[PDB]
Amino acid sequence: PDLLTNVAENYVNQDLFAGIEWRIDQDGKPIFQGCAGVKDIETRTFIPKNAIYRIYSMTKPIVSFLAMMLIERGVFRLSSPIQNFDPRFKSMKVIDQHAHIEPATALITIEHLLTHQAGFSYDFSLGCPISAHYRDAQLIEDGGRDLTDMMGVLAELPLVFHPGTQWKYSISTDVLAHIIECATGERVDDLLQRLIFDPLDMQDTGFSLPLDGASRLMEVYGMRSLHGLPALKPAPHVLVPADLGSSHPTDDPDFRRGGHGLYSTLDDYMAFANMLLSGQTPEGETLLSPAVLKLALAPRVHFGARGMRINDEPFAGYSWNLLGRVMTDVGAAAYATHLGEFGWSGAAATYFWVDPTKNMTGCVMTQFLGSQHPIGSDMQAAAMSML
Amino acid sequence: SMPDLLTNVAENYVNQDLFAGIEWRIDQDGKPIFQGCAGVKDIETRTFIPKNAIYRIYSMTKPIVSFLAMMLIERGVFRLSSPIQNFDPRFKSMKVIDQHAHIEPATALITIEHLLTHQAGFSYDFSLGCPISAHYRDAQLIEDGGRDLTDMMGVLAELPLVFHPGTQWKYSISTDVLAHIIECATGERVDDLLQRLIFDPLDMQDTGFSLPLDGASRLMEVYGMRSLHGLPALKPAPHVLVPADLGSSHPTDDPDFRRGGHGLYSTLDDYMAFANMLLSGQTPEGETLLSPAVLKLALAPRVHFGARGMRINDEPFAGYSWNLLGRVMTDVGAAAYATHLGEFGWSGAAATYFWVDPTKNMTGCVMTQFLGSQHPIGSDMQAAAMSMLG
Amino acid sequence: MLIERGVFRLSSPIQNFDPRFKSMKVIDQHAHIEPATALITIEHLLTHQAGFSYDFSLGCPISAHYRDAQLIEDGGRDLT
Amino acid sequence: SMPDLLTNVAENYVNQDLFAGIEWRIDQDGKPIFQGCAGVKDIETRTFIPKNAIYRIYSMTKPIVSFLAMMLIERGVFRLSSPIQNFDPRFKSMKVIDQHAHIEPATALITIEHLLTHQAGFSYDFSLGCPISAHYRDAQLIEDGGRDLTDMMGVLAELPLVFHPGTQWKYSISTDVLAHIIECATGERVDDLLQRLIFDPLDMQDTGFSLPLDGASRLMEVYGMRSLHGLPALKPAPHVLVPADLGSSHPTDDPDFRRGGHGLYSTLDDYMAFANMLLSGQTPEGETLLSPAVLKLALAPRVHFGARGMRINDEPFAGYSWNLLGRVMTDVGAAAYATHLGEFGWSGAAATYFWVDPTKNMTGCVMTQFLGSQHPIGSDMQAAAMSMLG
Ligand SMILES: O=[N+]([O-])c1ccc(OP(=O)(O)O)cc1
Ligand SMILES: O=[N+]([O-])c1ccc(OP(=O)(O)O)cc1
Ligand SMILES: O=[N+]([O-])c1ccc(OP(=O)(O)O)cc1
């Protein structure tokens, strides 16, 4: 049966998500797709054609792919120290949970940024020795602050471990976007447009809305604590519109970030996902060589007993490569997958995957912050089970 | 023939514009042997240090409330092993948070002993890098001095600890929890218990959580830029003699203000009475406040530290272990300033400091008011006194 | 099959379906008892990593209490 | 000037309906310095505590049988290193079981020293979570008091140990094994040996495994809900003053009942005679029961514990190590109630407790009958006496 529809319709019928779209492609063509629910529960408008989503950290694989392109082109390399491009990142310090501060004993590199092993953290990180100082500095909160200036403020704060030595999901993709700007003399949104979006015909993807985008923007729900005091337990899963403050503007021509901030559509994100199966456009234009794509996808960070975790939530059987998660042990996985399946997700519950063993890609688009229901993994499992 | 190094230290500090006013006294065999004063009550006015000047002693409150706990143990109200949840069920089912966002139930009950040793897993609002201090600040545990002790404890009780009770050491709000548990166990207020069991018998008439009737004109001005409850600083505040803003954390005339870990006003003379008593457990007249057996139980080294040593916000207390009342010198060859084996006492945020040295039958106290001092005046005065007493 | 059908998932805490399994404790061979520090999941049950034992388990810190409770012995008792 | 905290403790316990009747005595320099009684013989009848009241002292039997072992060592019957299998071949070829169902041969012989230190690997029927206690209960080792010591030991000998002899510590039935090995080595009965070598010389006329002829009317009633040999409890039995059913585990008039780890009846006065003797190894008249060298051998700390400390059924004995006769205080800074370095003694299941404190030439004993007390009356009485003796 159509497990994907059953999952999505159950979520809508239980008042857990307002609206959901999905598509799964094989060999670059749709084999499953659908939608459930509405754009917004307040007026129950149907999900529009080419509906627009805040994809949050699904921005990261895109910005990471751009960095790989610049590496291939010789702009910098995995081992390049970031201080070479912005000296504000010379002389970093490292703080610990016992209030001890000392100089970093290793320089932060491009590779560290792409692997979240640089020692940065995130404003919303619970129990973190530095997240209070991120919150005070409004790093995530102040969406109106130019990328360049936000980085100056971040650069003055201590890391939470010595670069290279541990893993922690972090604001490092934003650092990467900034370093890209320093290295190229170009803005990251312009680079993304020219090198990735245009070639893949992703006309609806950017850090601001298309001129006709307002009526297509999905409403966002949920109570997650994104820049306030980190919650000691998850907020109740209730469909109430989320307040994004000034963290995520719709029409700021200078808003650009590395770790979040893109608006996209299901169709646009599917084009990016399909490309990751080969490094080419559908017409056959190369965006990244097979060699460098293999370098980007190979498992690079391996995890101990407790596995990969973010705010203590597990990613069972996953390792980290230069673009996001990668399945390295089906016997440890918590939901259907195959060896080498890779991808990432976003705070508003958007999720995608690429499964090279099946030449398969999939994406679930929805808008819920702080979900207590792992819709992304439920939809991947459903799709896997339908092959 | 040794010169007066005590006066020299105090004088230099005042002449260097580092502290406004400083008073000190060192007693031996219960009688003053060195004493002095330097500077003024306040720098704005240069009013002279009044007779019986009054100081906010902050954590020098801790040895007093700890001593009261020991008296109650001696009297059978509770024991070191008593789980605090027996007296306040709000402390049943504690959780423990870590630096990786992981929360789990505590695997051990918090006891009276844990509170007196700072091994309960509590923290403090100003603790830099702490997995929970952000939640303390949001709750305004320290900032909101007007909140009753009992109500503040209800808010604290809902927060997780930062390690499992008994398994580590971290200087903390646990003495406030102890003051509260004392009230739960006895059905009395901690300020009344302190008044009747300690202050009255020792004639400490100027000591309490609010100013005496004639106290306002005797209150020393407090200086410095330490932030007691704001975002913890990444480096020490500059040492500048500017008056400190205490907000509403340390009221002068709130008849219900009472705490375990700070909040007392006292005077040099009153505190010396307490310190001298600690040499024997008796009042000068010979009333026993605490038997020699239980005083020995309280002073014996109880928490021992591992290479890193005892630290608070990463500042070292070199060669010190912890007993039920505060610090205790356990290795002179690791000490960072003059002392003798067994020397004990504590200090307060505004740079007040005292010690008791049983090998010399000596006590010492320096009183001053500076929050966030970059100069360890307490240890400098102790070292000076040690150097002067053979 | 029920996982494939979406009834629950490997990571589902069992207490979500029967709250009698909230607040489990853990015993050891030295008589020490403490609260469990992790919730039991469907995956734990399928892998025998939940911490349960068996009435007939020799040397087990809890099998005596299973035997006293007749868990295996009392076949007539309803599963629930 | 210190008030009578001993009477206060006892009184409160009786007035709170927590214990039926309590007697205590503290001696210094071999003469009574504090003493008293509180409550009644039995709550049903409220009969007053009789003269020379008799108590089941349970594991306060252990220091007595241990002391007899030391006398026999001094006399050359055996040595600390003697393998017990030399005296009873039933203890040849022991096995060791673990919590994972694995059984293997013991890699070391059990010695006299192992039995006196509870390091032989034996356990006890009531031990919660134990790899072997289920088999002890099936065998009715404790329950069947009517079974001769010699026969019970044959049944025990067939069971595996829970660790290899010498490698760990667990409070156990090993003192019963010792009593038995004493009988094997000497060809005499342990009760006769105790009578001749210890009770007679110390004039302990009311002490033995059966009641004196006029004993029944003097026997204190025993209360409480602890289950001595049933399925071990997952949490403490409620503390309720209801008479306890001892079944046939503790007969009053069985001329062959004798054990190493429990079973003696005694009186406060008789036990104080034993305790006082332990200060010197001599009778009041000056007969040597045990030379100073061997008494020192017996009292020196012999088993040292690792962070977790000494525990029995997970209850702590904080700051205590173990010597050949029972507990010994080795760190006052880890102690959970007042004491001095070197204080030693033991206690019994029905809440009887005694201590000897060589630094004060002091002994103390509290007698009461409550099985499974949730209130540590023994330690409370010790703390009270310590507080009263400077
Ligand atoms: O900017 N943000 O609010 C923000 C940025 C990144 C986040 O992380 P994610 O949940 O992995 O997308 C979550 C929130
Ligand atoms: O409440 N307070 O502001 C506060 C309490 C305790 C303190 O700790 P101290 O520096 O050891 O006195 C410091 C400040
Ligand atoms: O035989 N018994 O019933 C028995 C034997 C030993 C006991 O151990 P205790 O509590 O240390 O006296 C308790 C009970």
Short mmCIF file of C-alpha atoms in Angstrom, two decimals, chain A residues 93 95-101 125-130 132-133 135-136 156-158 160 166 168 229-233 306 311-312, chain B residues 97-103 127-132 134-135 137-138 158-160 162 168 170 231-235 308 312-314:
data_model
loop_
_atom_site.label_atom_id
_atom_site.label_comp_id
_atom_site.label_asym_id
_atom_site.label_seq_id
_atom_site.Cartn_x
_atom_site.Cartn_y
_atom_site.Cartn_z
CA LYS A 93 40.61 30.28 23.00
CA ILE A 95 36.57 27.15 27.33
CA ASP A 96 35.50 24.17 29.44
CA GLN A 97 32.65 23.24 31.80
CA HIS A 98 34.91 23.98 34.80
CA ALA A 99 35.36 27.65 33.78
CA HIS A 100 38.88 27.02 32.51
CA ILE A 101 40.00 28.97 29.46
CA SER A 125 22.71 24.27 22.75
CA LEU A 126 21.59 23.03 26.18
CA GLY A 127 24.30 22.58 28.86
CA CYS A 128 26.98 24.10 26.58
CA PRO A 129 29.89 25.92 28.23
CA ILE A 130 29.57 28.78 25.65
CA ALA A 132 24.99 31.62 26.89
CA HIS A 133 27.56 33.95 25.31
CA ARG A 135 22.68 34.03 23.11
CA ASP A 136 23.85 37.26 24.73
CA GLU A 156 35.85 36.89 19.91
CA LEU A 157 34.23 33.99 21.78
CA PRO A 158 35.98 30.79 22.96
CA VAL A 160 34.29 24.46 23.45
CA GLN A 166 35.79 16.41 19.02
CA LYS A 168 29.66 19.16 17.90
CA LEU A 229 17.00 29.83 27.33
CA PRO A 230 17.46 26.22 26.15
CA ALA A 231 14.53 24.06 27.28
CA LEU A 232 15.04 21.25 29.81
CA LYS A 233 12.43 19.15 27.99
CA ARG A 306 26.88 6.80 22.20
CA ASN A 311 21.25 18.08 21.87
CA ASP A 312 21.48 14.42 22.97
CA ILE B 97 22.34 17.49 33.41
CA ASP B 98 25.65 17.32 31.53
CA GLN B 99 27.62 19.51 29.08
CA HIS B 100 26.34 17.40 26.19
CA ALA B 101 22.66 18.25 26.83
CA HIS B 102 21.98 14.83 28.37
CA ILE B 103 19.59 14.72 31.34
CA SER B 127 29.38 29.97 37.36
CA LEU B 128 31.16 30.35 34.02
CA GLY B 129 30.77 27.45 31.54
CA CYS B 130 28.37 25.61 33.85
CA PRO B 131 25.77 23.25 32.31
CA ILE B 132 23.02 24.77 34.49
CA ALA B 134 22.04 29.82 32.74
CA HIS B 135 18.88 28.37 34.25
CA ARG B 137 20.16 33.26 36.21
CA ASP B 138 16.89 32.96 34.31
CA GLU B 158 12.99 22.00 39.89
CA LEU B 159 16.37 22.44 38.19
CA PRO B 160 18.78 19.64 37.44
CA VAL B 162 25.37 19.08 37.37
CA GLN B 168 32.23 15.45 42.61
CA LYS B 170 31.58 22.24 43.04
CA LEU B 231 26.35 36.68 32.02
CA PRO B 232 29.50 35.16 33.53
CA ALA B 233 32.63 37.08 32.46
CA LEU B 234 35.24 35.56 30.15
CA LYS B 235 37.96 37.53 31.93
CA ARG B 308 43.95 19.98 39.64
CA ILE B 312 36.28 27.80 42.12
CA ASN B 313 35.66 29.31 38.68
CA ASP B 314 39.11 27.88 37.86
#
